[PDB]
């Protein structure tokens, strides 16, 4: 019944910034709202309960506000430890229900990806499959679009992407997209291309090869 939503899904900010993130309940939930912090692959930590009560031991730069359907979490001066995902949560005697989370990453200047394409190896082809890999290296911000084109035809459904965590030195992301085809399908076409759209690029960048060259 009760649906918790959060906005924005992502926020980029600098150390020292004042950050505010929002949580909405689909119906009034009084002050029955908590906020949790989670770092990747680690148990979350309770920050705030009763909408505005700081949990014991939590740094006072965190505060919460709101009642009813609209709630906010504010960090008065964002610190290095605070890059994380934040979840709100409604609690009652029968259930707990979490919002979807807001991920806060570290702002830096825009950086366009360096793009590379890799044909399948002859060794993999000998076993009947072709993996074609497109690499986007060291870019910021995270939003990026990869489109595979095979003899100009836009591909859908036959690729998977993976992204690194933000780099601890240069604050960038890197991303791989892998197009997987059977050997027989791979041999039906000639031109394999990865087209990358990113706001650091005025025009999309395409890397391509001709099969067998």
């Amino acid at each position: 019944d009760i649906v918790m939503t959060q906005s924005p899904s992502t926020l980029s900010a600098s150390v020292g910034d004042r950050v505010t993130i929002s949580c909405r309940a689909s119906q009034s939930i009084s002050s029955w709202l908590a906020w949790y912090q989670q770092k990747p692959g680690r148990a979350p930590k309770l920050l705030i309960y009763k909408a505005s009560s700081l949990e014991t031991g939590v740094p006072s730069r965190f505060s919460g506000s709101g009642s009813g359907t609209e709630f906010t979490l504010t960090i008065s001066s964002l610190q290095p430890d605070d890059f994380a995902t934040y979840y709100c949560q409604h609690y009652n005697t029968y259930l707990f229900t979490f919002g979807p989370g807001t991920k806060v990453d570290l702002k830096r200047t825009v950086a366009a990806p360096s793009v590379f394409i890799f044909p399948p190896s002859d060794e993999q082809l000998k076993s009947g499959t072709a993996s074609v890999v497109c690499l986007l290296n060291n870019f910021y911000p995270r939003e990026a679009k990869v489109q595979w084109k095979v003899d100009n035809a836009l591909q859908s459904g036959n690729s998977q992407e993976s992204v690194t965590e933000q780099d601890s030195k240069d604050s960038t992301y890197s991303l791989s997209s892998t197009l997987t085809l059977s050997k027989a399908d791979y041999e039906k076409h000639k031109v394999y291309a990865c087209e990358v759209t990113h706001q650091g690029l005025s025009s999309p960048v395409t890397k391509s090869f001709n099969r067998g060259e």
Partner: protein, 218 residues
């Protein structure tokens, strides 16, 4: 204070799993899971008011939570397992914290357990195939580490002598049920053909180790 959890499990689809949480000096325990790439999802727990179980609607009819007070242990048994049940399952104490107007409220309070990974899969343990991502300023090259189960693999370059510029991507689960990952490195173009680049892949579950030299293609 500590919540000690049982260990990681690989379970076939359709089967059931029973995960445990034991307190270190009795509390009401709740279970929250996180599937790969997804948010936190409450599963169910013992109520600190009624000392009886409460379940999220999505799992009602498929999860049973029990507690043996004589061993300070609470159990979550999830049946008819599906691929989307693959997740880290965390336990936490559900602790009555405050009251307002005669109504008292409980929260999931620190510390949580470390989590238990439940992987729902029919796949058998299998080591990867390793293929080169051959290089064509700055050049990129890499290794494709394909078709292994379960996670993880590790990848190093030149037996650890090459670390700068390396990105080893998180694995993806393929439709086949096997994992795949690539590891890439950027190097000076001028070093190609004089220097030797080898990826060292280790998959401990299958005790497989593979070294693959990555060179420009003729």
């Amino acid at each position: 204070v500590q919540l000690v959890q049982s260990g990681a499990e690989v379970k076939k689809p359709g089967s059931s799993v029973k995960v445990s949480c034991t307190t270190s000096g009795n509390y009401a325990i709740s279970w929250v899971r996180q599937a790969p790439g997804q948010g936190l999802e409450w599963v169910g727990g013992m109520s600190p008011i009624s000392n009886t179980p409460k379940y999220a609607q999505k799992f009602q009819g498929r999860v049973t939570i029990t507690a043996d007070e004589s061993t300070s242990t609470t159990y979550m048994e999830l049946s008819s397992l599906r691929p989307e049940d693959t997740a880290v399952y965390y336990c936490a104490r559900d602790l009555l914290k405050y009251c307002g107007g005669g109504n008292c409220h409980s929260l999931l309070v620190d510390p949580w357990g470390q989590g238990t990974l439940v992987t729902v899969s029919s796949a058998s343990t299998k080591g990867p195939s390793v293929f080169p991502l051959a290089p064509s300023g700055t050049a990129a090259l890499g290794c494709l580490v394909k078709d292994y189960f379960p996670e993880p693999v590790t990848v190093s370059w030149n037996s650890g002598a090459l670390t700068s510029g390396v990105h080893t991507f998180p694995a993806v689960l393929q439709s086949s049920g096997l994992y795949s990952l690539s590891s890439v490195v950027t190097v000076p173009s001028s070093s190609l053909g004089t220097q030797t680049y080898i990826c060292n892949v280790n998959h401990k579950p299958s005790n497989t180790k593979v070294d693959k030299r990555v060179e420009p293609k003729s």
